[PDB]
Amino acid sequence: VEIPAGDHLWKSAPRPSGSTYMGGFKAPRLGRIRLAFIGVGGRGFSHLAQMCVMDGVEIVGICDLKEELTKRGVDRVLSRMGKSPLGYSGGDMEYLTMLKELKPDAVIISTDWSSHARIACDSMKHGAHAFVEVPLAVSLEELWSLVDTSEATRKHCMMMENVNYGRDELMFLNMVRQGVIGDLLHGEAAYIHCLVTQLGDTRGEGAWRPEYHTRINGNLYPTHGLGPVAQYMNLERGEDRFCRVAAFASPALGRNAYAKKHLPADHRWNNTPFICGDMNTAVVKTQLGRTILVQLDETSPRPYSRANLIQGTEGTLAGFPTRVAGEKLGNGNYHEWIEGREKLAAIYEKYDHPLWKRIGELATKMGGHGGMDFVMLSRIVECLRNGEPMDQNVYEGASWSSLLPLTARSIAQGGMPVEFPDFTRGDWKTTMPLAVVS
Amino acid sequence: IPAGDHLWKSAPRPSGSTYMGGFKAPRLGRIRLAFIGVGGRGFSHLAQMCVMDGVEIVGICDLKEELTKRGVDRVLSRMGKSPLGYSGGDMEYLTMLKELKPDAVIISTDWSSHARIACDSMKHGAHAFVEVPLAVSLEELWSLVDTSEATRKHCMMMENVNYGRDELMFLNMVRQGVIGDLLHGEAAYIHCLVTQLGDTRGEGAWRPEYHTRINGNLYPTHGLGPVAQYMNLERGEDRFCRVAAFASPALGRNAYAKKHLPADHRWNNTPFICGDMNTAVVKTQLGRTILVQLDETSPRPYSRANLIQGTEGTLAGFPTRVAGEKLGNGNYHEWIEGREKLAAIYEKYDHPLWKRIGELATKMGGHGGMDFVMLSRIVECLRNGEPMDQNVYEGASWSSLLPLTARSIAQGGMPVEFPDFTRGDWKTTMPLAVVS
Ligand SMILES: NC(=O)c1ccc[n+]([C@@H]2O[C@H](COP(=O)([O-])OP(=O)(O)OC[C@H]3O[C@@H](n4cnc5c(N)ncnc54)[C@H](O)[C@@H]3O)[C@@H](O)[C@H]2O)c1
Ligand SMILES: NC(=O)c1ccc[n+]([C@@H]2O[C@H](COP(=O)([O-])OP(=O)(O)OC[C@H]3O[C@@H](n4cnc5c(N)ncnc54)[C@H](O)[C@@H]3O)[C@@H](O)[C@H]2O)c1
Ligand SMILES: CC(=O)N[C@@H]1[C@@H](O)[C@@H](O)[C@@H](CO)O[C@@H]1O
Ligand SMILES: CC(=O)N[C@@H]1[C@@H](O)[C@@H](O)[C@@H](CO)O[C@@H]1O
C-alpha cells in the first residue's frame, strides 16, 4: 500500500488559461444519471444498495478487485432494477476499462485512501463526475491534482462527507444561518471512534487502514467532525477560509499494546511500530481569526464522538450529546444545556433543516448512519439531475482533507503552525456560501 | 498590569536557599492566621476557618474599612475573640504583618497584588496561601519561588478544584492504574462573567481590565490543577514542557459594552483584546497532551472539562462520566454517567479524603464542598508539619499558562518552553499520594 510520508506528504502553479474555477459550478443536467461504482466493499456496497431505489439513476457498471464483491453488487442491482450493470474485476487498473467502455456520467469511488486521487482524476479525465469517499486524498500533491483536474475537465469532484447531512448537523447549519448564536468565534471537531480491533482484520479496512498508523503521525481522518463546522463558518466560500493549523499528538501506545496482547509474536503489527499518537489534537486558525479544535483518536477505548461544537457570541451548539444553549433558545437561560429528547423537541420543531423535513423521514427508513447517507446521496442525485451546484465543492473537500498532511507536517516540525494552501487561488472571496437548501 | 514582553520575560538559586519540594514546616499546634483581602472570596475563607480547631484568626486586612469590620465581627461572633482589623491603604497589610507576625496568611486580593503581598508575608515569617492565579507574570512567579526557597516558608496557591469529589476520585482511579498509561488531558475554565463589565463593586473593579491588556489564558488553573496532578507533573514522573496558544476573535465584551454601557464609559473607549475563547495545547516531557481552554465571556454553561484519558479508559467531568475496560461491564462504547450508574463508581473509587471530610464539606459548602476540604487539608498539614498537597512549583507552573499562552499568541501560535521553576529538582520530588 503506497503511503506518502515525510516531505512528499506535505510538499507543493497558477491555473491554466483553459481551466475554470469550479466554485458554484453547474454541470449539464442529467435526467438519468448513468452511474458506476469503483470499489464495492462495505462502504461502496452501502451506496450501491441505497441508489438502486433512487429515481433518475441507472447503475451501469461495478468494479472491485474482488470478483465476488463485483458479483454481489451486480446481483443486487439486477434484483432491484431489472437490468444488470457490467461487472469488472481483477487488477487495480481494471476500472479504466470500465470508464472507457461505459462512459458513465458519474462514478462513486469507495476504495482505500491510497487510490482515491488517482481513480478520481482518471474518472474526470474520462468524462465522469467523481464522488469520492473520505478523506479526499492523502497528500497535498494529490489534493492539488484533483483540484487541477476538475478545473481542467470541468467535471464535478465532491468528497462524500455524509456528516454534514445529519439531522443535528443540518439543524445547526440552519440555526447558524439564521444568526441564532450571534457572531461565530470557535468550533470543535473530532473523530473519536475505537477502531483498534481492525488490527485483527486481514480483510476490509483492516487490510489497509492500520498501516497508515505505522507511517504518518497526524490526523488521518479529519473530515467527519470538521465538515459541518467548516460550512457553519462558510470556510472557503466568500466569508472566511482556513489559514493555519498547529498539530500535536499524544504518545503512540494503544495499537502497539493491542498487538502484543492479542496477536502472535510473528504478526506484522508486532514487528512494525505504530507511530501515530493515539489522540491527535490540532487547532485551526481561520482568516477571520476563528479557532477550530480538531481531534482524532481511533485507538483509545472510549465512546464515539464527532464533537460538532459551534460557538458564537450569543450561544453554543454541540453534539454528542446534542445540546444547545443561548439567549434566543428555550427560556434563554444559557447557564444550562437544553438537552435530552424532551427539551430538544421544541428545538427540532423550530429549527429542523427543511432538507431534513423533506428527506429525513425516508432517510431514517433507508438508514445509513441514521439517515445522513440517504440525504447526502439524494442531494447528489438532485444536483446532478437539476444541473445545480453541489453543496460541497472540490475546494472544501481538499481543504478539509488537507488537515491530514498539514497536521503531520506541523507535528514533524515540533508543533509549529503551518499555512493552508489556497486551492481556490484567491477565488474563495467570490464563492457563494452554502445556503439553507429548500 | 504587565503587558508585552514584561509579561513573559525573565538567576541561580542562592547557596543558602532550600528547594521546597516536599517541604515540612515546623508543627503548629496553634495556628495564628491572618487574612489579607476579605471581599467575596476572602470572607468565604474566613467564615469557614471559624469552625477549625487549633486556629486563631489574629488579623484581618482589606482596603475597605467596612469589609474589615464584617470579617472582624464574624470572627468575634463565631470564635469569641476579636482579631485586629486593618484598612485604609494598599500597604496597610505590612503593618499587620509587622504588628501581628502571623504564622500564616490567606491572600484573596485581586491578581495584581498576589505576588507582592505573598512575598512580603513570607519575608515577615508567615506561610502564604494565595488565591488563583498565583501571579500574572513570569518574574512575579520566579519571585515567589525564590522568596519561598530563601525564607523556607510555605507558598501554596489555593487551587480548590483539586479537592472536588470527582477530581479526588479521578486522582484515586488514576493512581490505581484504572485507565492504563496516561495519554491526554483536557482542562478548561468556561464561565460567563461578562456582566462584570457593568459591576463596579466586586471583581468588576479589577478583572475586566485584564481583557484590555492581555490576550491569553487569564485563568488557567481551575481545570488544569487536577489534570496536572493526575499526570504527576513537576513531581518526579513528568513536567510541563511546551505550550502553543490560540485565541478566537475578541468580540463579546466589546458588544456588551456598546449594548449596556454609555458611549463615554471606559469599556466603550478601551478595546477588549483578549479572545473570547482561548485554546492552548500543552506537551509534557513524557509526550502527553493537555488541552487548556478559557472562555469567561461567551454565554454557555459552566465547565472545567476535567478529562483525563489513558490507554484503558477515559474519565471526564461536566457531566461526570467514565468509560474503560475495567469500568462497569467494560463496554467502553457508552459512558457510565448519571446518578444511577455512577453510584457504583463512587462506592468503589471514592477518595478516602472525601469519605473522611466530604459529608461535613457538603454541609459547609463552598463550590460544593471542595473549599472546606482544601482548607481542612491546609490546617491539617500546618498542624501536623506535613507537606502541602500542592507545592509552590506546581502553583507557579499552572499559573505560568497565563504569560506563556500570551507569549505564544504574540508569536503567532509558536510553541513556547516552560521554565523549570524547580531548577531540575522536579526529578526527585515525590508525587502526591492518595492522602487519608
Ligand atoms: N463516510 C462514511 O461514513 C464511511 C464509512 C465507511 C468507510 N468510509 C470510507 O470509504 C472508503 C472505503 O471504506 P470500506 O469500509 O468500504 O473499506 P473496504 O476495504 O471494505 O472496501 C474497499 C474496496 O475498494 C476495492 N478497491 C481498492 N482499490 C481498487 C481499485 N483500484 N479498483 C477497484 N476496486 C478497488 C477493494 O477491492 C475493496 O473491496 C474508505 O475511504 C473509508 O474511509 C466512509
Ligand atoms: N478559588 C475560587 O474558587 C475563587 C472564587 C472567587 C474568587 N477567587 C479569586 O480570589 C481573588 C479575589 O477574588 P474576589 O472575588 O473576592 O474579588 P473582590 O474584588 O471581591 O475581593 C478582593 C478584595 O481584596 C482587597 N484588596 C485588594 N488589594 C488589597 C490590599 N493591598 N490590601 C488589602 N486588601 C486588598 C480588595 O479591597 C477587595 O475587597 C481573586 O484572585 C479571584 O480570582 C477564587
Ligand atoms: C460517520 C462515521 O463515523 N463514519 C465512520 C467511517 O468513516 C469509518 O471510519 C467506519 C470504520 O468502521 O466507521 C464509521 O462508520
Ligand atoms: C471553582 C471556580 O470555578 N471558581 C470561580 C472563581 O475562580 C471566580 O472566577 C468566580 C468569579 O465570580 O467564579 C467561580 O467561583
Contact B246, B420 (CB under 8 A): no
B323 Cβ inside 6 Å of ligand 4 = no
Separation CA A300–CA A385 (nearest Å): 43
Q: Among A246, A249, A303, whose Cβ lies nearest the Cβ of B334?
A: A303
Separation CA A309–CA B188 (nearest Å): 15
Question: What are the beta bridge partners of residue B289?
Answer: B184, B283
End-to-end CA distance of chain B: 41
Q: What angle do CA A173, A174, A176 make, to 5 degrees?
A: 65
Using the mean position of ligand 3's atoms as its centre, give its distance from the Cα of residue A259 in Å. 22
B-chain CB neighbours of A259 within 8 Å are: none
Letter for the amino acid at B231? Answer: M
Intervals of CATH 3.30.360.10 along chain A: 164-430
Intervals of CATH 3.40.50.720 along chain A: 32-159
Separation CA B106–CA B55 (nearest Å): 13
Q: What angle do CA B120, B123, B127 make, to 5 degrees?
A: 85
Nearest ligand (C-alpha, residue A305): 3
Separation CA A243–CA A289 (nearest Å): 9
Kindly tell me the burial class for residue A187, based on how many C-beta atoms sit within 10 Å of its own C-beta (0-12, 13-18, 19 or more).
buried
* CA nearest neighbour of A393 among A34, A139, A190, A146: A146
> Reduced to 3 states, what is the DSSP secondary structure of residue B379?
helix
Kindly tell me the burial class for residue A427, based on how many C-beta atoms sit within 10 Å of its own C-beta (0-12, 13-18, 19 or more).
middle
Name the grid cell of A130: 467523481
* Beta-carbon contacts below 8 Å between A and B: 154
Nearest ligand (C-alpha, residue B85): 2
* Cα torsion through B431, B432, B433, B436, rounded to 10: 160
B109 Cβ inside 6 Å of ligand 2 = yes
Task: Give the containing element (helix H, strand E) for B397.
Answer: helix B392-399
B-chain CB neighbours of A185 within 8 Å are: 248-249, 251-252, 275-277, 298
> Reduced to 3 states, what is the DSSP secondary structure of residue B169?
helix
The DSSP secondary-structure symbol of B243 reads E
Using the mean position of ligand 1's atoms as its centre, give its distance from the Cα of residue B187 in Å. 37
> Reduced to 3 states, what is the DSSP secondary structure of residue B227?
helix
Q: Among A186, A257, A334, whose Cβ lies nearest the Cβ of B277?
A: A186
Question: What are the beta bridge partners of residue A371?
Answer: none
B-chain CB neighbours of A248 within 8 Å are: 244, 281, 283, 289
Contact B361, B373 (CB under 8 A): yes
Using the mean position of ligand 2's atoms as its centre, give its distance from the Cα of residue B252 in Å. 24
Q: Among B183, B302, B412, whose Cβ lies nearest the Cβ of A251?
A: B183
Q: How far is CA B208 from CA A184, A393, B140, in A?
A: 22, 43, 21
Name the grid cell of B128: 502564604
Phi-psi group of B102: left, alpha or beta (phi > 0 → left; psi -120 to 50 → alpha; rest → beta): beta
Task: Give the containing element (helix H, strand E) for B291.
Answer: strand B289-295
A-chain CB neighbours of B237 within 8 Å are: none
Q: Among A285, A304, A315, whose Cβ lies nearest the Cβ of B246?
A: A285
The DSSP secondary-structure symbol of B303 reads B
Count of Cβ atoms closer than 10 Å to residue B189 Cβ:
25
Q: Describe chain B by its helix, strand, coil percentages, rounded to 5.
A: 40, 20, 40
* Sheet architecture: strand order including B155-157: B84-86, B55-61, B31-36, B104-107, B127-130, B155-157
B-chain CB neighbours of A420 within 8 Å are: none
* Cα torsion through B41, B111, B209, B274, rounded to 10: -110
Q: Would the CB atoms of B281 and A283 count as touching at under 8 Å?
A: yes
Question: What are the beta bridge partners of residue B293?
Answer: B188, B279
Q: Please count the helices (runs of H) and the strands (runs of E) in chain B.
A: 16, 15
Q: What angle do CA A315, A318, A321 make, to 5 degrees?
A: 135
B303 Cβ inside 6 Å of ligand 4 = no
Determine the distance from the C-alpha atom of residue A419 to the mean position of all C-alpha atoms in its chain, rounded to a whole number: 21
The β-bridge relationship of strands A57-63 and B313-316 is unpaired
Letter for the amino acid at A331? Answer: N
- The single residue listed with the C-alpha cell 507576625 is B101
Determine the distance from the C-alpha atom of residue A229 to the mean position of all C-alpha atoms in its chain, rounded to a whole number: 12
A369 Cβ inside 6 Å of ligand 3 = yes
Is the domain covering B162-428 a CATH 3.30.360.10 domain?
Answer: yes
Q: Would the CB atoms of B314 and A302 count as touching at under 8 Å?
A: yes
* Sheet architecture: strand order including A280-286: A338-339, A323-326, A315-318, A309-312, A184-192, A291-297, A280-286, A242-249, A418-419
Q: How far is CA B45 from CA B37, B162, B423, in A?
A: 10, 16, 33
B-chain CB neighbours of A183 within 8 Å are: 249, 251, 255
Kindly tell me the burial class for residue A379, based on how many C-beta atoms sit within 10 Å of its own C-beta (0-12, 13-18, 19 or more).
buried
Kindly tell me the burial class for residue A259, based on how many C-beta atoms sit within 10 Å of its own C-beta (0-12, 13-18, 19 or more).
buried
Nearest ligand (C-alpha, residue A205): 1
Separation CA B187–CA A352 (nearest Å): 33
Count of Cβ atoms closer than 10 Å to residue B417 Cβ:
11
Instruction: Tell me the HSE value of B419 on the side-chain side, using a 13 A CA sphere.
Output: 25
B-chain CB neighbours of A312 within 8 Å are: 298
According to CATH, what is the number of the domain A164-430?
3.30.360.10
Q: Would the CB atoms of B244 and A325 count as touching at under 8 Å?
A: no
Residue of A nearest to B194 (CA): A313
Query: Which of B48, B72, B108, B196 most suits a substitution to test ligand 2, by most atoms within 8 Å of the C-beta?
Result: B108
Contact B311, A257 (CB under 8 A): yes
Name the grid cell of A109: 469511488
- The single residue listed with the C-alpha cell 448513468 is A34
Contact B358, B369 (CB under 8 A): yes
Separation CA A270–CA B20 (nearest Å): 45
Task: Give the containing element (helix H, strand E) for B417.
Answer: strand B416-417
B203 Cβ inside 6 Å of ligand 2 = yes
Using the mean position of ligand 1's atoms as its centre, give its distance from the Cα of residue A136 in Å. 12
* Cα torsion through B107, B108, B113, B114, rounded to 10: 60
Name the grid cell of B189: 475554565
Q: Among A254, A313, A326, whose Cβ lies nearest the Cβ of B252?
A: A313
Buried b (16+ CB within 10 A) or exposed e, B282-310: bbbebbbbbbbbbbbbbbbbebbbbbbbb
Task: Give the containing element (helix H, strand E) for B130.
Answer: strand B127-130
Task: Give the containing element (helix H, strand E) for B67.
Answer: helix B65-79
Question: What are the beta bridge partners of residue A282?
Answer: A247, A294
Question: What are the beta bridge partners of residue A286?
Answer: A242
Three-state secondary structure string covering chain A: CCCCCCHHHHCCCCCCCCCCCCCCCCCCCCCCEEEEEECCCHHHHHHHHHHCCCCCEEEEEEECCCHHHHHHHHHHHHHHHCCCCEEECCCCCHHHHHHHHHCCCEEEECCCHHHHHHHHHHHHHCCCEEEECCCCCCCHHHHHHHHHHHHHHCCCEEECCHHHHCHHHHHHHHHHHCCCCCCEEEEEEEEECCCHHHHHCCCHHHHCHHHHHCCCCCCCCCHHHHHHHHHHCCECCCCECEEEEEEEECCCCHHHHHHHHHCCCCCHHHCCCCCCCCCEEEEEEECCCCEEEEEEECCCCCCCECCCEEEECCEEEECCCCEEEECCCCCCCCCCCEEHHHHHHHHHHHHCCHHHHHHHHHHHHHCCHHHHHHHHHHHHHHHHHHCCCCCCCHHHHHHHHCHHHHHHHHHHCCCCCEECCCCCCCHHHHCCCCCCCC
Contact A310, A232 (CB under 8 A): yes
Contact B92, B61 (CB under 8 A): yes
Using the mean position of ligand 1's atoms as its centre, give its distance from the Cα of residue B134 in Å. 54
Q: A60 phi and psi, to 5 degrees?
A: -95, -25
Contact A103, A96 (CB under 8 A): no
Using the mean position of ligand 4's atoms as its centre, give its distance from the Cα of residue B167 in Å. 16
Separation CA A4–CA A11 (nearest Å): 10
A224 Cβ inside 6 Å of ligand 3 = yes
Name the minimum distance, in Å, from the CA of B119 to any CA of chain A.
36
Using the mean position of ligand 2's atoms as its centre, give its distance from the Cα of residue A161 in Å. 50
End-to-end CA distance of chain A: 43
Separation CA B186–CA A279 (nearest Å): 12
Contact A431, A403 (CB under 8 A): no
Q: B228 phi and psi, to 5 degrees?
A: -60, -40
Nearest ligand (C-alpha, residue A162): 1
Separation CA B301–CA A333 (nearest Å): 9
Residue partners of A93: CB distance under 8 A and separation at least 6: none
Q: Among B244, B279, B298, whose Cβ lies nearest the Cβ of A415?
A: B244
Name the grid cell of A1: 500500500
Residue partners of B351: CB distance under 8 A and separation at least 6: B165, B168, B169, B171, B172, B434
A-chain CB neighbours of B412 within 8 Å are: 244, 417
Contact A64, A48 (CB under 8 A): no
Instruction: Mutation target for A interface from B184, B332, B405: give the one with most A CBs within 10 A.
Output: B184
What residue owns the CA closest to ligand 1's atom 11?
A110
B110 Cβ inside 6 Å of ligand 4 = no
CATH architecture of A32-159: 3-Layer(aba) Sandwich (3.40)
Q: Would the CB atoms of A186 and B311 count as touching at under 8 Å?
A: no
Intervals of CATH 3.30.360.10 along chain B: 162-428
Separation CA A373–CA B350 (nearest Å): 44
Q: Would the CB atoms of A283 and B184 count as touching at under 8 Å?
A: no
Name the minimum distance, in Å, from the CA of B404 to any CA of chain A.
15
The DSSP secondary-structure symbol of B58 reads E
Residue of A nearest to B335 (CA): A303
Count of Cβ atoms closer than 10 Å to residue A429 Cβ:
11
Separation CA A221–CA B179 (nearest Å): 25
Q: Among A253, A334, A337, whose Cβ lies nearest the Cβ of B311?
A: A253
Separation CA A25–CA A2 (nearest Å): 32
Name the grid cell of A411: 507535528
Q: Would the CB atoms of B281 and A415 count as touching at under 8 Å?
A: yes
> Reduced to 3 states, what is the DSSP secondary structure of residue B97?
helix
Contact B429, B253 (CB under 8 A): no
A-chain CB neighbours of B413 within 8 Å are: 244, 246, 283, 285, 417
* Cα torsion through B348, B351, B352, B358, rounded to 10: -110
* Sheet architecture: strand order including B182-190: B336-337, B321-324, B313-316, B307-310, B182-190, B289-295, B278-284, B240-247, B416-417
CATH topology classification for B5-10+26-158? Rossmann fold (3.40.50)
Task: Give the containing element (helix H, strand E) for B316.
Answer: strand B313-316
